Enzyme design. Structure first.
Site, PDB file in Angstrom:
ATOM      1  N   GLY A   1       1.040  -1.165   0.361  1.00 19.14           N
ATOM      2  CA  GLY A   1       0.108   0.058  -0.079  1.00 19.14           C
ATOM      3  C   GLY A   1       0.840   1.202   0.132  1.00 19.14           C
TER       4      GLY A   1
ATOM      5  N   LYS B   1      -2.276  -3.169   8.387  1.00 20.64           N
ATOM      6  CA  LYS B   1      -2.463  -2.005   8.266  1.00 20.64           C
ATOM      7  C   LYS B   1      -2.341  -1.152   9.543  1.00 20.64           C
ATOM      8  CE  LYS B   1      -6.716   0.970   6.513  1.00 20.64           C
ATOM      9  NZ  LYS B   1      -7.807   0.679   5.862  1.00 20.64           N
TER      10      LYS B   1
ATOM     11  N   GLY C   1      -1.306   5.911   4.175  1.00 19.96           N
ATOM     12  CA  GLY C   1      -1.822   4.570   4.198  1.00 19.96           C
ATOM     13  C   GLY C   1      -0.825   3.453   4.054  1.00 19.96           C
ATOM     14  N   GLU C   2      -0.415   3.164   5.218  1.00 21.54           N
ATOM     15  CA  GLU C   2       0.588   2.149   5.180  1.00 21.54           C
ATOM     16  C   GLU C   2       0.227   0.722   5.164  1.00 21.54           C
ATOM     17  OE1 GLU C   2       3.984   2.333   7.700  1.00 21.54           O
ATOM     18  OE2 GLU C   2       5.009   3.929   6.702  1.00 21.54           O
TER      19      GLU C   2
ATOM     20  N   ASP D   1     -11.457  -1.769   2.804  1.00 18.27           N
ATOM     21  CA  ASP D   1     -11.125  -0.424   3.096  1.00 18.27           C
ATOM     22  C   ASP D   1     -12.474   0.363   3.787  1.00 18.27           C
ATOM     23  OD1 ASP D   1      -9.123   1.779   2.948  1.00 18.27           O
ATOM     24  OD2 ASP D   1     -10.819   2.756   1.996  1.00 18.27           O
TER      25      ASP D   1
ATOM     26  N   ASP E   1     -17.124   4.463  -0.302  1.00 21.85           N
ATOM     27  CA  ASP E   1     -15.807   4.401  -1.102  1.00 21.85           C
ATOM     28  C   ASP E   1     -15.556   3.565  -2.271  1.00 21.85           C
ATOM     29  OD1 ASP E   1     -13.487   6.002  -1.506  1.00 21.85           O
ATOM     30  OD2 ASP E   1     -12.193   4.817  -0.261  1.00 21.85           O
TER      31      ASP E   1
END
EC number: 2.7.11.22
Lengths: 307, 251
Positions: free
Chosen positions: A20, A38, A21-22, A149, A131
């Protein structure tokens, strides 16, 4: 040292690579089981633990379904926090862009069926994803589609007792953002998610977001050149919006026409037309969409494993 | 699903017991944390639900940690700050800290919001919130008996009075007992309605069948248990000054 029975240290996992916001891919050190880590961003967060993360966690913990990304657990670091998810090899954007990838109608049927099934599930649980876009659709190595997400998702309600809902309006990426939102609507529901699904269906053939806007006004003009022009005749009560003409709209439905080239099958085109419907209340819902003759025709939906 | 429910023997051997805290002492420490939560919660103008959520957070937190290590007066404010965020009634960090300070030290006066001391207690709160989150394993969605009370009251066509008294029983069941660590919210709700009926001299008619009302709420519930738990709750209520007065028919 303090007791901590229920938050394991992320050290149990071995970090392999920023996907990937890691976002990191990682490997459980004992079983080899692959996961996604995440990390919770605390850039500033002058108010303790981020309320949005609390929200996302509450929602991920609620949603347990084959076509929804799975939060396995939450890990600490000994300070940071990581959300641990079941790992997914592919994501629709990476597949729709890689030319070395080809779908048959049957597998596309399968993709859309799992996707609409995920939406049906989250809506039945009073959640809006907010989203919708290709990059948030994951696919596992074994051909199972998962929605991911939820950092922008939100619970909704039966907004009666004569007090319309005041949900946030600047939600969902521009190219996938439905008409309702662009006019400043705050009493919206599940249909906003269904609209993006429309855009993605078409994307299965155009291999590219059908409607790419510079700004919101560009998005609305572009949207109009495909779906016709807004009108109390097409969309009763449309007038009610403060930005109707106040937004320099164009008075002017080439939707089935502009896509005929890419998408060949009629039923598919009919379904996309019923998803990309202007009036949200006249827009097909997940239940009827799953029911559409499109999923009930000769090239029946097929697994993806094969590919 | 049975992670946060304990046997009486598990309740006896709590982390605090293992550090030389009497049963009774520990129970007292819990009631004081709930009192502080209620005071702060009222002043911050959050709902009773939010205060309740923070109270369960506290109750569970002390099945893992010891009072000898974490004082009620430190854990309560953080638990409430967290519950307020979780229940959608977010209160600002400085705000909860200011109210915490006036509740604990009515006669002191807030430090310079610029001092190293104040900066340190803000950082202590944030730290304690993180410790709470990790002790609870980020399981933050709490079910309360009150939900089941509303439903059930109607399901006996109870006076408004009776319903008011039942919610009161539920809240006091949170402040005064560890029922939330032993029995599910629907069971507790049955306990509260039962005590409320006895207290109001109300009688729920035997169902047309011969099935008792509570049987429609939770199948595991028995009259033996109801009578035992109402007697326990009633006993602690009698030890709480002015508490029964609030529901006492004074006519």
């Amino acid at each position: 040292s303090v007791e901590c029975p229920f938050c394991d240290e992320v050290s149990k996992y071995e970090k392999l690579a920023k996907i990937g916001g890691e976002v990191f891919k990682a490997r459980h050190r004992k079983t080899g089981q692959k996961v996604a880590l995440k990390k919770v961003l605390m850039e500033n967060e002058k108010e303790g633990f981020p309320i949005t993360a609390l929200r996302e966690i509450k929602i991920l913990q609620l949603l347990k379904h084959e076509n929804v990304v799975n939060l396995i657990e939450i890990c600490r670091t000994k300070g940071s926090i990581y959300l641990v998810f079941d790992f997914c090899e592919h994501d629709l954007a990476g597949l729709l862009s890689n030319v070395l990838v080809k779908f048959t109608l049957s597998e596309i049927k399968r993709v859309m069926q799992m996707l609409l099934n995920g939406l049906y599930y989250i809506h039945r649980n009073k959640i809006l994803h907010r989203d919708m876009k290709a990059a948030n659709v994951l696919i596992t190595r074994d051909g199972v589609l998962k929605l991911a997400d939820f950092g922008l998702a939100r619970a909704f309600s039966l907004a009666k007792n004569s007090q319309p809902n005041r949900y946030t309006n600047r939600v969902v990426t521009l190219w996938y953002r439905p008409p309702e939102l662009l006019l400043g609507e705050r009493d919206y529901g599940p249909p906003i998610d269904l609209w993006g699904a429309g855009c993605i269906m078409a994307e299965m053939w155009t291999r590219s977001p059908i409607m790419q806007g510079n700004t919101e006004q560009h998005q609305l003009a572009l949207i109009s050149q495909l779906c016709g022009s807004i009108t109390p005749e097409v969309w009763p009560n449309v007038d009610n919006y403060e930005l109707y003409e106040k937004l320099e709209l164009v008075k002017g439905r080439k939707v089935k026409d502009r896509l005929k080239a890419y998408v060949r099958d009629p039923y598919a085109l009919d379904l996309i037309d019923k998803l990309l419907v202007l009036d949200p209340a006249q827009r097909i819902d997940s239940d009827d969409a799953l029911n559409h003759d499109f999923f009930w025709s000769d090239p029946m939906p097929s697994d993806l494993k094969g590919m | 699903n049975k992670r946060w429910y304990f046997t009486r023997e598990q309740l006896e051997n709590s982390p605090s017991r293992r550090f030389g805290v009497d049963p009774d002492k520990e129970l007292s420490y819990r009631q004081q944390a709930a009192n502080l939560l209620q005071d702060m919660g009222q002043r911050l103008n959050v709902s009773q639900l939010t205060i309740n959520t923070a109270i369960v957070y506290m109750h569970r937190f002390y099945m893992i940690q010891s009072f000898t290590r974490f004082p009620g007066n430190s854990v309560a404010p953080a638990a409430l700050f967290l519950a307020a965020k979780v229940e959608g009634q977010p209160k600002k960090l400085e705000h909860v800290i200011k109210v915490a300070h006036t509740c604990l030290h009515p006669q002191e006066s807030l430090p310079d919001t610029r001092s190293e001391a104040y900066l340190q207690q803000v950082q202590d709160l944030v730290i304690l919130e993180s410790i709470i989150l990790q002790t609870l394993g980020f399981e933050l969605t709490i079910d309360h008996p009150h939900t089941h009370v509303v439903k059930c009251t109607q399901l006996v066509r109870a006076s408004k009075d009776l319903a008011q008294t039942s919610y009161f029983m539920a809240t006091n069941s949170l402040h005064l007992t560890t029922f939330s660590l032993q029995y599910t919210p629907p069971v507790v709700a049955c306990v509260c309605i039962h005590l409320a009926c006895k207290w109001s001299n109300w009688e729920i008619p035997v169902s047309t069948d011969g099935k008792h009302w509570w049987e429609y709420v939770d199948a595991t519930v028995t009259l033996e248990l109801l009578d035992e738990l109402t007697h326990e709750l009633l006993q602690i209520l009698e030890k709480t000054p002015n508490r029964l007065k609030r529901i006492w028919n004074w006519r």
